[PDB]
Amino acid sequence: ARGPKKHLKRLAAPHHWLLDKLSGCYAPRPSAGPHKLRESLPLIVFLRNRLKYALNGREVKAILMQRHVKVDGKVRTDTTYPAGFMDVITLDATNENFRLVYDVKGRFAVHRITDEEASYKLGKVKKVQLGKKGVPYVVTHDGRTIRYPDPNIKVNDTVKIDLASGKITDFIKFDAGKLVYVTGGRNLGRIGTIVHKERHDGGFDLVHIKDSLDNTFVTRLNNVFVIGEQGKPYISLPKGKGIKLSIAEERDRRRAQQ
């Protein structure tokens, strides 16, 4: 290809974007940004398809150009800024706040969080290193670099940001008996409550997680996002709390509680 691709066909965009087959042949390629290509939601597909605040990409650009939308507190005046998991975005019109979160079935659900909730975001530390001048730093899941972290925090922990500065206000370790979120795999959007982690020295640590309904499952360590201790999660959970209702009981709950 002689260089990076700049287009994205439909049928090649990630499935969880909930795009249709027809009415166009190019899906919005998310630009380079904090989140990966596949595991990100472009602002174009959010502001347009998720909420129907707009009818097309031109009119989303009109929404964008006036600096009304801002994710993590920053405006992001571009069509395809890749807002990803647990990102907070804000619509100052009537003070509407959004936390990009996973639903039960593995798609980016639409939240409604309050102002004090939208202040903070949760970041999973991807790696712990020290940079130039012996200054330590942690790389979060969204690509943030935070200098001088608490020495007690290691890889696979979860730090919470304030989004008004770059500092870590609080954090939670990775251990058995901690509330976790699944970000990836076929268990996407399920909330886990870690019970065990088996190692496999040399690659792909596995973690066993059982949700509130006593259903246990296994996922790779890179797919686990700790979000709190037992009881209170650090963030507001979505509707359904990630319990993974089966099709039979999802059929019943759809019939009774329409």
């Binding site: 439909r10 049928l11 087959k21 027809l22 166009g24 042949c25 089966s246 099709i247 039979a248």
Partner: protein, 124 residues
């Protein structure tokens, strides 16, 4: 290019064309129900084939299998909704015994004939 528009056939031609017993029955069927083609029978028998295939695979699975518990119930509700099989059953029985006459009995051509506003299948 834009993603391809999927399409699928709805009818199936019989393996042996000149069957006296089958030819007589199908033209007998068209008269009693006012259909214009044999393809109007071919599709119903093709629709029935997909249904008997669905129930046959489901019934090979054991009882209290989540697949047939969900897919069998869904097929029952769809078939009861369209009125092809009797509604006073809860045993996944009639599906494999559904005959061709049941499907085109529920068509609007005959539905408005027996509802009294048409007075004939051809008039309907």
């Amino acid at each position: 290019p834009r993603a391809p528009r999927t399409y699928s056939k709805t009818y199936s031609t019989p393996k042996r064309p000149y069957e006296s017993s089958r030819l007589d029955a199908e033209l007998k069927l068209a008269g009693e129900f006012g259909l214009k083609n044999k393809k109007e029978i071919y599709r119903i028998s093709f629709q029935l084939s997909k249904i008997r295939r669905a129930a046959r695979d489901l019934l090979t699975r054991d009882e209290k299998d989540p697949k047939r518990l969900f897919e069998g119930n869904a097929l029952i509700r769809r078939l009861v909704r369209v009125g092809v099989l009797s509604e006073d059953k809860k045993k996944l029985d009639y599906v494999l015994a559904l005959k061709v006459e049941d499907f085109l009995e529920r068509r609007l051509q005959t539905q408005v004939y027996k509802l009294g506003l048409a007075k004939s299948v051809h008039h309907a």
